[PDB]
Symmetry: C2
Subunit: 215 residues, 2 copies
């Protein structure tokens, strides 16, 4: 019965992670010391309840930009064009001139986007190695390499109109570069017209795959 | 050790459910008896492998319409911005005049959409009570009630431009009916301009939340 743990305190507003892997607002209604660490009981605003580890709760405020760094464990807004969801990720880039003063987020499922400071929430008790709670092993391993090598970031230069092969579902596909935005490129898959924003250091882009397998 | 279980045959193309709850093409590489039933080993096209229950694999073909019914357990195409994913659900409506010859799908996460016959795949070994493998209990219970009562479906009649309260994250929001499509309405949330398709029998729509209470 930990009524408090640092600035965590029962009755506070909080975000908690659900089994959809999206994050939702609620109230912290209990803290319990249990075996090695602590667990946080959240009552979500839709009345659901969950007992969560400290890396599965986030503060209901936007961190000051000067408290974030490459590797920071965050919850960020994800937008499909009509709906908005909150999903966990890693800060891959902080605001700078070339990225038009945005944060690049690497989400736990492998997606990447640029967001603003007002679209982020800090996870309360992230693991010492921030990537170690990423479920997708290929994503986890990529983040570990990326944060460890930062700022050494191999990327490929692409231009609008350029024709390249892009990976999807374990095979290569004919694709076209539609647009470049900072460290991201918008790829059109020519066969079925899906579009995707992809990190320019991703080995899903054949030139990066190659530039990295160049022997 | 089996090479065949009915028309599940080692080497066949298949869809398998991953931990993202999306479904992905692969090959059936093994059939194993483990404990009381069978498991199906799938090698995904990206070379990952999973040992899956029969309700977590689907055939890689579109079922004949008129072999689908209300309650059928299916995998359906979902549009996520400019991306397309496969996700499990239940058939809520079969093609008719009112729905412009489409299938209404109630997805396992509570979303609903109309799809065509070429956007569906049949799950290989669904449970006889097909909803019983839905993880979200509120969703599971809704589907059980819906299928049991079908065709008797309380729904509210809405028209484009109508202003109503719609529930989201446990509170009620000023919203507007933008469009009616069969048993779905497209709701604009006026505060933040999110848009969402919602079933006209959902108690997230204030008028339905009251029609139900009135009964
Ligand atoms: C960050 N990811 C992004 C993902 N998109 C995406 N990922 C990748 C990866 C490589 N490429 C791409 C790509 O192109 N995209 C477009 C959608 C994903 C998501 C997950 C659950 C959910 O659940 C919604 C929900 C439903 C019911 C109740 C609560 C929540 C909604 C969205 C979040
Ligand atoms: C069917 N549901 C629909 C859901 N949308 C949605 N649901 C609800 C529920 C009430 N309302 C709404 C609403 O408005 N929406 C818009 C997105 C959800 C999804 C899940 C995972 C995923 O993962 C993508 C992925 C990423 C990396 C690797 C593999 C896969 C992509 C999409 C699927």
């Amino acid at each position: 019965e930990l009524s408090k743990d640092g600035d965590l305190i029962v009755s506070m507003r909080i975000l908690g992670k659900k089994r959809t892997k999206t994050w939702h607002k609620g109230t912290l209604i209990a803290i319990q010391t249990v075996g090695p660490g602590k667990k946080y009981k959240v009552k979500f605003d839709n009345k659901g309840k969950s007992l969560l580890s400290g890396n599965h709760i986030a503060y209901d405020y936007h961190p000051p930009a000067d408290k974030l760094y490459v590797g920071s464990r965050v919850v960020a807004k994800y937008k499909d064009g009509n709906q908005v969801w909150l999903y966990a990720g890693i800060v891959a880039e902080t605001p700078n001139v070339k990225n038009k003063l945005r944060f690049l987020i690497f989400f736990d499922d492998g997606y990447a986007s640029y967001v603003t400071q007002s679209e982020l929430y800090p996870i309360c008790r992230p693991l010492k190695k921030t990537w170690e709670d990423i479920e997708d092993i290929s994503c986890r391993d990529f983040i570990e390499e990326y944060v460890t090598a930062y700022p050494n970031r191999p990327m490929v230069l692409l231009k609008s109109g350029q024709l390249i092969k892009t990976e999807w579902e374990g095979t290569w596909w004919k694709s076209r570069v539609e647009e470049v935005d900072g460290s991201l490129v918008r790829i059109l898959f020519l066969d079925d017209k899906r579009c995707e924003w992809i990190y320019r250091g991703s080995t899903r882009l054949e030139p990066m795959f190659s530039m990295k397998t160049s022997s």
